[PDB]
Every structure is written in structure tokens, then in C-alpha cells.
Amino acid sequence: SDTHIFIIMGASGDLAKKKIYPTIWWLFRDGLLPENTFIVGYARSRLTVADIRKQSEPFFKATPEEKLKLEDFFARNSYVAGQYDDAASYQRLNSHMNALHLGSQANRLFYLALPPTVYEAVTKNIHESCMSQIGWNRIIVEKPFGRDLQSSDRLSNHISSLFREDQIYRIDHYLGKEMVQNLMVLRFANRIFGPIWNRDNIACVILTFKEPFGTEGRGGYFDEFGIIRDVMQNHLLQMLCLVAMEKPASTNSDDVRDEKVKVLKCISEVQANNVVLGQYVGNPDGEGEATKGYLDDPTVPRGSTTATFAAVVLYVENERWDGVPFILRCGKALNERKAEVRLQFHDVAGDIKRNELVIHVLPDAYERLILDVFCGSQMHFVRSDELREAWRIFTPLLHQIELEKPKPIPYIYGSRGPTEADELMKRVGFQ
Amino acid sequence: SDTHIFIIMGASGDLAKKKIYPTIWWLFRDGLLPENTFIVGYARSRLTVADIRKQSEPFFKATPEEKLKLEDFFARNSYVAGQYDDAASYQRLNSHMNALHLGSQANRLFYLALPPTVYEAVTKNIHESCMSQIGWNRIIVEKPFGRDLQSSDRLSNHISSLFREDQIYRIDHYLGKEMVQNLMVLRFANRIFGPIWNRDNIACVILTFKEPFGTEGRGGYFDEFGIIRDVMQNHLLQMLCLVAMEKPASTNSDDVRDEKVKVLKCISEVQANNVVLGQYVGNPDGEGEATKGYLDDPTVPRGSTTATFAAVVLYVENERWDGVPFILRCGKALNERKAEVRLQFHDVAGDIKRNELVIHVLPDAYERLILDVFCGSQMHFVRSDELREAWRIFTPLLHQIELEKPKPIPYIYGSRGPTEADELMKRVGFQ
Numbered sequence: 001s002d003t004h005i006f007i008i009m010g011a012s013g014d015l016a017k018k019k020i021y022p023t024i025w026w027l028f029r030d031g032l033l034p035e036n037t038f039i040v041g042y043a044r045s046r047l048t049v050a051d052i053r054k055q056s057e058p059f060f061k062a063t064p065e066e067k068l069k070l071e072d073f074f075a076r077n078s079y080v081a082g083q084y085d086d087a088a089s090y091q092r093l094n095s096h097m098n099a100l101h102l103g104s105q106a107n108r109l110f111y112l113a114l115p116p117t118v119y120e121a122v123t124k125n126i127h128e129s130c131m132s133q134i135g136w137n138r139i140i141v142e143k144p145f146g147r148d149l150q151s152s153d154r155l156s157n158h159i160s161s162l163f164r165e166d167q168i169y170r171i172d173h174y175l176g177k178e179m180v181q182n183l184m185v186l187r188f189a190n191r192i193f194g195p196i197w198n199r200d201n202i203a204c205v206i207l208t209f210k211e212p213f214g215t216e217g218r219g220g221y222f223d224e225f226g227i228i229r230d231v232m233q234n235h236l237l238q239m240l241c242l243v244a245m246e247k248p249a250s251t252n253s254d255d256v257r258d259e260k261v262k263v264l265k266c267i268s269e270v271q272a273n274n275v276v277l278g279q280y281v282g283n284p285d286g287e288g289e290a291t292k293g294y295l296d297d298p299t300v301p302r303g304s305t306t307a308t309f310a311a312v313v314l315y316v317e318n319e320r321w322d323g324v325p326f327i328l329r330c331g332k333a334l335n336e337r338k339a340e341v342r343l344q345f346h347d348v349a350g351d352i353k354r355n356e357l358v359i360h361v362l363p364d365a366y367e368r369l370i371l372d373v374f375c376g377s378q379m380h381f382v383r384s385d386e387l388r389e390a391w392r393i394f395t396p397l398l399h400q401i402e403l404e405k406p407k408p409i410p411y412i413y414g415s416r417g418p419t420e421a422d423e424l425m426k427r428v429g430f431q
Numbered sequence: 432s433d434t435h436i437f438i439i440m441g442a443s444g445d446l447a448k449k450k451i452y453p454t455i456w457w458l459f460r461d462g463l464l465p466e467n468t469f470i471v472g473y474a475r476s477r478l479t480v481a482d483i484r485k486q487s488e489p490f491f492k493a494t495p496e497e498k499l500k501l502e503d504f505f506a507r508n509s510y511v512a513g514q515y516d517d518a519a520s521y522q523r524l525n526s527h528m529n530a531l532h533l534g535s536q537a538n539r540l541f542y543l544a545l546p547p548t549v550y551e552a553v554t555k556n557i558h559e560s561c562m563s564q565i566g567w568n569r570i571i572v573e574k575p576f577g578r579d580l581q582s583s584d585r586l587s588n589h590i591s592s593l594f595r596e597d598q599i600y601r602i603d604h605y606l607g608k609e610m611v612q613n614l615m616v617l618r619f620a621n622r623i624f625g626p627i628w629n630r631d632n633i634a635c636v637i638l639t640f641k642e643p644f645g646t647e648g649r650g651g652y653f654d655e656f657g658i659i660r661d662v663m664q665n666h667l668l669q670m671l672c673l674v675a676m677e678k679p680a681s682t683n684s685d686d687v688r689d690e691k692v693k694v695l696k697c698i699s700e701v702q703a704n705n706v707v708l709g710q711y712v713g714n715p716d717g718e719g720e721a722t723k724g725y726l727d728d729p730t731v732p733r734g735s736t737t738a739t740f741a742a743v744v745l746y747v748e749n750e751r752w753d754g755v756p757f758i759l760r761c762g763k764a765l766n767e768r769k770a771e772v773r774l775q776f777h778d779v780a781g782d783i784k785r786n787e788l789v790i791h792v793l794p795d796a797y798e799r800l801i802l803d804v805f806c807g808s809q810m811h812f813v814r815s816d817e818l819r820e821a822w823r824i825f826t827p828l829l830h831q832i833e834l835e836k837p838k839p840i841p842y843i844y845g846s847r848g849p850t851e852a853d854e855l856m857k858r859v860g861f862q
């Protein structure tokens with residue numbers, strides 16, 4: 001219909017204060033949210049809308065000329081305090097939403113801006129209390145979607161034991177503002193160069209994610225996950241799918257996601273001989289944060305073998321791609337800020353250097369993602385089976401890394417990474 | 432066999448002194464010429480090898496460590512003086528070549544480093560005097576290959592009335608050192624993206640040749656030809672062919688040139704409504720040669736309407752390409768030194784900006800060209816029918832330009848050119 005209720009489960013938190021509230025404010029300001037939209041925060045800390053405004057408006061980039069729409073925005077805001085497993089608190093939340101103007105009939109969008117540890121409880125109570133009877137119900141869940149196949153399956157089975165898949169929105173938006181554009185142009189490239197992309201023309205494909213900055217005083221959070229879970233398993237794998245997929249049945253989100261899952265179901269589990277791990281150390285001659293290494297970060301626990309750079313070779317195993325190596329190379333604190341997809345060709349030149357086709361890169365990625373959840377297009381959101389296949393591919397390697405704790409290869413801040421990664425590339429065929 | 436005689440008809444001249452002798456010296460120095468190679472200059476001016484050495488070795492980049500191979504090179508050099516229509520002088524040349532070590536059996540390569548005005552006479556006498564009886568005979572003819580369809584046909588029929596087509600080498604090497612590489616990568620791109628390049632995926636193709644420098648005190652020679660004859664009619668048209676051509680029967684020079692001619696035979700004669708002409712004027716705020724315009728060049732005759740920039744729309748007319756506009760945009764004194772081929776796609780994006788595939792760019796072009804004439808690969812040399820078709824396409828427009836003398840559009844030194852050219856691009860569909 002026309003009435004929407006934006007619930008922010010965990011509004012007192014960092015993501016809600018620094019990102020969620022500013023982005024929904026920007027969408028409302030630019031007239032992109034539906035006209036009859038309400039925003040409701042929910043957490044345990046006893047707050048008022050004035051407190052959330054006080055702590056969040058610094059991030060709003062509020063100018064003196066848009067203060068009227070800002071007052072309207074905060075007039076459409078409310079806050080309800082309660083526990084995350086207290087049935088009475090969810091009853092109070094449900095009644096408060098039912099009290100809003102034509103709130104009964106309204107579509108409800110729940111942003112689970114909460115540590116995943118509590119998701120279980122929340123997804124239960126929301127199911128039995130706060131769901132809508134008429135309007136649709138959509139849940140936005142956040143990283144981490146587990147850390148291995150077992151945890152991710154238990155969490156995904158719990159969530160997909162209460163809400164249908166067309167109600168679950170797994171959002172990933174921390175790798176830049178051009179992520180959605182990355183995936184869009186890669187899908188367009190697959191639709192265009194479909195007939196050319198075979199094992200006959202291509203000898204090797206690469207997917208690169210370089211960032212020239214380190215952890216920057218926040219390596220503590222990165223340490224618990226690693227560069228494989230942060231970049232490769234979710235993003236680089238999704239665009240590998242987008243590259244290697246067949247022509248979808250249509251332009252429905254579900255058909256192209258079916259093709260992505262069909263691609264994932266052909267990638268066998270990666271093993272350590274096809275993997276090079278690296279950790280960045282301080283540059284002695286550079287200046288600034290380049291002088292500090294990974295272990296020199298105050299937040300990083302000492303003795304951490306966590307890889308901040310990974311080069312991994314995968315193989316799609318069907319008739320279209322066989323023996324064609326997909327080299328996923330990503331790493332923090334490198335030489336450039338580059339996200340590219342290069343496909344090297346079988347040369348045939350008769351002559352009496354290898355050629356490659358390269359793919360580089362109004363609303364930002366996160367803004368477009370929220371607006372997509374509003375429209376209901378699950379295009380840029382990973383599905384349950386897609387996530388399960390990705391975790392299946394990368395979880396034996398990850399279990400080995402956790403058990404044996406292999407020391408990563410040291411590479412210098414600003415370098416391209418270990419030379420052993422380039423050796424691994426040479427092994428399967430490259431430049 | 433193993434013995435080669437490099438005749439330089441017109442060795443006293445500018446091209447021979449500044450380019451031909453240095454490049455054959457570089458080939459001999461790098462061991463690329465056949466071991467039993469002799470070089471023979473021929474002109475009317477009474478010279479000795481010492482004189483040619485005196486006037487040409489400045490351009491040799493001679494270092495003190497290669498002086499021995501340089502002495503050997505000039506030992507393999509000789510010079511014969513005589514007129515260009517004197518039968519006795521050609522008899523003396525033929526006898527002198529027959530006197531060289533096993534010169535009778537030797538392959539003979541004639542470089543017609545002469546004004547085309549005399550080619551006729553030369554090609555006659557060489558035919559009846561200096562050709563070899565055993566070894567092959569190959570002629571290198573130079574620009575201009577006529578200035579319109581009639582002159583080019585009379586010259587080409589005269590030359591192809593004495594030497595078979597596998598003996599005629601029309602060389603064009605003045606547009607940079609990467610021309611051969613341009614054509615090679617474009618042929619590879621056609622062989623790869625063959626199935627994609629249809630009227631169904633592509634809405635517009637462009638071929639760009641920008642140069643940031645003006646005429647530089649030598650606009651007098653450029654005035655007699657124009658930017659259409661200098662860049663478009665020969666080079667941009669050849670790479671248009673390379674883009675739009677079908678899959679050749681093989682990798683023989685003649686099969687791919689057959690495909691290029693088949694492409695040319697489908698381009699009807701261009702008319703002035705699809706053409707934008709421009710002339711560059713001095714930049715008032717820039718410095719250096721940018722302060723001087725085209726007419727401010729001392730060599731340029733005043734009142735010259737000669738276009739130094741051209742934007743021309745052509746159309747291949749078959750089933751693979753129909754209504755697909757090929758926009759050939761070239762010009763001196765522009766913003767960049769760019770040579771690109773961009774193909775814009777029919778977007779289909781459903782959504783609740785147009786994409787394009789872009790193609791940019793050991794021996795230099797001219798060096799590789801001479802070495803090709805030695806090997807005998809007529810790949811990067813225009814054929815008689817190819818040249819005739821190009822002249823047919825561009826000669827009615829050129830005749831109109833000569834008759835009516837239309838004033839070109841003034842554009843500033845360093846600019847991208849006339850805005851009317853971009854209007855013409857918009858008319859048929861672009862960005």
C-alpha cells in the first residue's frame with residue numbers, strides 16, 4: 001500500500017547512529033522514501049527521540065536550509081524500550097506500531113541492527129508479536145552470517161524457519177559505495193559477452209580487491225574474521241558467480257540468483273595448496289599509518305596469524321568452464337585501491353604478449369540497498385542456498401587455518417603482496 | 432635464397448637520409464636483415480657512399496662500441512648516379528647490381544623513395560632493366576597514392592600494369608610507431624569478439640585519432656592533402672575494415688585483405704551532411720606553438736580552407752551491420768594524443784548510462800614494415816582494390832570540398848574540436 005514502518009532493532013547502537021539513521025534521513029530528504037513512512041527505534045537503553053537526534057544529527061550533514069524537512073523527519077520518529085527476549089516488551093512495541101496512523105495495514109521493514117548473537121531471540125519474538133497482518137514483513141539481517149558452514153546453517157535454518165525467503169534480506173555494504181554498481185556492470189557484462197566466455201577463448205580469470213589503507217586502529221574487529229571472510233567469501237565469490245553464470249531465465253531476482261547458485265554448486269572445496277596468505281607489516285621508510293604494521297595495531301592481539309591478504313584459486317567444473325582458473329586476489333594495505341575483473345585469452349597469433357579483456361568500475365550502494373529492500377528486489381542480496389554453497393566451499397580451508405594456525409607471509413605496507421602469490425598465479429597460468 | 436639487394440631509388444632525398452638509411456642500419460645492426468644483404472642508392476646527384484654517410488650518420492644514433500658493424504654496413508653500401516628516365520642509367524644500375532657478389536640470383540627490393548610524380552617512369556625502366564631473373568622483385572611505393580579516385584586509378588593501373596600485386600608494397604608509416612600494433616590488436620579483437628559484433632548489440636562505433644600538436648612550421652605540405660587524406664582515408668578506414676570484417680578464410684594476408692575489401696564494397700559514398708570540418712586557431716592564453724594557429728604558420732598559404740579536423744559518419748550496409756554508424760573523428764592540435772576504438776552497446780537494463788567496449792593501444796611500425804616486405808607478408812599493406820574502394824568512398828566529398836571551398840569551423844588549439852561535430856554525433860546516436 002502506502003504506509004511503511006521502519007523498525008530499527010538496536011537503534012542505540014553504532015551502525016544505527018552513524019549509518020542507518022543518516023541514510024534513511026537522506027532518503028526521506030531526497031523524497032525517495034514513501035510519503036507515509038514512520039521510523040521506530042527499539043533497544044533496551046531508555047532513550048527518547050531527542051537523545052537519538054542529539055547523538056546522530058552530527059552525522060546528518062544537516063544544512064540550515066533543510067531544517068524544516070528535518071523537523072518533519074524527526075516528527076515521524078519514535079522509540080520503544082524493551083528487552084530482546086521479553087514477550088511483554090515486544091507486545092508494547094507491537095501495540096505502539098498499531099497505534100501509528102493507519103499502522104495496522106502498513107508494510108513493516110525490520111532492520112536487525114543488532115549483534116547476530118541475539119538474532120535468534122529477536123527473529124522469534126518478531127515472528128510471534130510484531131509481524132503485520134495485512135502489509136508485507138521484510139527482515140534485514142546483518143553480518144556476520146555465521147563464521148563457518150555449521151554456524152551459518154544453524155542461523156539460516158532458524159531464520160528460514162520463521163520467515164519465507166522473500167522476506168529475508170542479507171545486506172553487505174561495507175566494501176565501498178560502488179558495490180551495487182560492480183555487480184550491475186558484471187551482470188551486464190555476462191549478458192553481453194555470454195557467448196564469448198567459454199573455456200575455449202579464456203585461459204584464466206582474476207578478481208582483484210586491493211585497498212591501500214591498513215586496519216587503522218580497528219584491527220581488533222578484523223582479527224575475528226579474516227580477509228577471506230571479509231572480502232572473498234561474500235563479494236568476490238558473488239562476482240565470480242556473475243562472471244561464470246549462464247543466461248538467466250529472465251530478469252527476475254530469483255532466476256539470476258538460481259544461476260549464481262548453479263555456478264556455486266560446481267566449485268569444489270578449496271585446499272591450502274591453492275591458497276597464499278599474507279600479513280602486512282609496517283613500512284620503515286613510509287610515513288603516517290604506513291609506519292605501523294598489522295601487529296603494531298593496538299587492537300590486534302599479539303601472535304595473530306590472521307591473514308590480511310589472500311590469493312585463492314578456484315575452478316568451476318562444467319562444460320562451459322573446465323580447468324579455467326579463477327584467481328581471487330584481495331588484500332588490505334596494498335599499492336592501489338583497485339577492484340577489477342580481468343579475463344586472459346588463449347592467444348593463437350601466428351607470427352614470422354597475451355591479451356585480456358578488463359572490466360573496471362546516483363544513490364550509493366547502501367542507499368540503493370535500502371531502497372531495494374523497500375521496493376522488494378532481492379537482486380543484490382545473497383540467498384540462503386547461495387550463502388550455504390559459499391560457506392561449503394570455504395569452510396574446510398578455514399577450519400584448517402583455525403586448527404594449524406599457519407603463519408602468513410609478511411608483506412610490506414604499500415606492496416602488492418607476497419611474491420608467493422604471484423608464483424601461485426604462474427603455476428596455473430597467467431601473464 | 433640468401434642474397435638481397437636493397438635499392439633506394441632516390442637516396443639523396445629527405446626520407447632516405449633521415450629515415451630509410453637509419454632504419455635499415457638499425458635492422459642490420461640488430462641482426463634482423465639477411466646476412467647477405469647489399470644496399471644500393473640511386474639518384475641523379477653525383478654522390479659517393481662517403482657523402483651519404485656524412486649527411487645521414489647524425490641520424491644513426493651511432494655509439495662508439497658499434498663502430499665495427501657500422502663499418503661493415505657501409506662496406507655493403509654502394510651508389511649509382513643516373514636519371515630516372517634514362518635507359519642507359521638504368522642499364523648501368525642493372526650491371527652494377529649484377530656485379531655484386533652472387534647478385535644475379537639475388538632477391539631485389541626496390542624502395543621508391545621518390546616523389547610519386549616520377550613513379551611512372553621509374554616503374555617502367557625498372558621493369559625493363561633492373562628486375563631479377565631468379566630472385567623475387569618487390570617494389571615499395573610511397574604516399575601519396577594519388578589524391579582522388581582518378582589519379583589513384585591511373586597510377587595504380589600503371590604500376591599494376593608491370594608488377595603483380597604480390598610485388599607491390601604500399602607503405603604508410605607516418606602516423607606513429609604503434610600503427611602495426613593498432614592493426615594487429617584490432618584484427619585480434621575482430622577474431623575474438625566476432626560473434627558479439629552485430630547490429631543487435633552495438634548501436635554506434637567510433638574511431639578516434641587525436642594529436643595534441645599542430646602542424647609545427649610544416650603546414651605547407653599538409654595543406655596540399657588535408658586531414659581526410661592524411662589520417663581518415665588510409666588508416667581510420669583500414670581499422671574500420673578490421674572492426675567490421677567477417678571471419679577470414681585463413682590467416683593468409685590475401686584472405687583478410689579480401690575481407691577488408693568486402694567491407695569497403697558496402698560503404699556508399701560519404702556526403703557533406705554527415706561531415707564536420709574544422710581548422711585550428713591559435714590559443715591566446717597558452718604558450719609555445721599553442722599561441723600560433725594554422726594560418727599563422729609561415730608555410731600555410733593564406734585563405735586556406737583546408738580542414739585539420741574531420742568528423743565523418745559512414746555506414747556498412749549488409750546484414751551484420753545496418754544503420755550502425757561508424758564515426759571517424761580525427762584532428763591535429765587537440766587535447767590528447769589518443770587512438771581508440773569504442774563500441775557503444777544497446778542497453779536493455781530494466782530498473783525500478785550506456786556501456787561501451789573500448790580498445791586502446793619490439794620493432795617500431797616502420798621497422799616491422801620493412802622487415803615484413805623482406806619476409807613478404809602483405810598484411811599491413813593496402814591492396815589495389817582496397818585503395819580504389821577507399822578513394823571511391825571519399826572522392827565525391829573531396830571533389831565538392833575542392834570546388835566550393837567550404838570554410839572550416841574554427842576550434843582552439845588544445846580544444847576537442849568543433850561543437851558541431853558533437854552535434855553530428857548526437858544526430859545519429861551517441862552518449
Ligand SMILES: NC(=O)c1ccc[n+]([C@@H]2O[C@H](COP(=O)([O-])OP(=O)(O)OC[C@H]3O[C@@H](n4cnc5c(N)ncnc54)[C@H](OP(=O)(O)O)[C@@H]3O)[C@@H](O)[C@H]2O)c1
Pocket residue numbers: 010011012013014015016043044045084112113114115116117118142143144174
Ligand atoms: N563489516 C562488518 O561485518 C560490520 C560492520 C559494522 C556493523 N556490522 C554489524 O552491524 C550490526 C550493528 O552493530 P553495531 O556495530 O552497529 O553496534 P552494537 O553496539 O554492536 O549493537 C547495537 C546495539 O546492540 C545491543 N547489544 C550489543 N551487544 C549486545 C549483547 N551482547 N546483548 C544484547 N544486546 C546487545 C545494544 O542495545 P542497547 O544496549 O541499547 O539495548 C547496542 O546499542 C552488528 O550485527 C554487526 O555485526 C558488521
Ligand SMILES: NC(=O)c1ccc[n+]([C@@H]2O[C@H](COP(=O)([O-])OP(=O)(O)OC[C@H]3O[C@@H](n4cnc5c(N)ncnc54)[C@H](OP(=O)(O)O)[C@@H]3O)[C@@H](O)[C@H]2O)c1
Pocket residue numbers: 441442443444445446447474475476515543544545546547548549573574575605
Ligand atoms: N606523410 C607523407 O605523405 C610523406 C612524408 C614524407 C615522405 N613522403 C613520401 O616519401 C617520398 C620521399 O620524398 P622525400 O620527402 O623524402 O624527399 P624528396 O626531396 O621529395 O625526393 C628525394 C629525391 O627525389 C628526387 N626528386 C625530387 N623532386 C624531383 C623531381 N621533381 N624530378 C625528379 N627527381 C626529383 C631528388 O633526387 P636527386 O636530385 O638526387 O636526383 C631528391 O633527392 C616522396 O614520394 C614523398 O611523397 C610522404
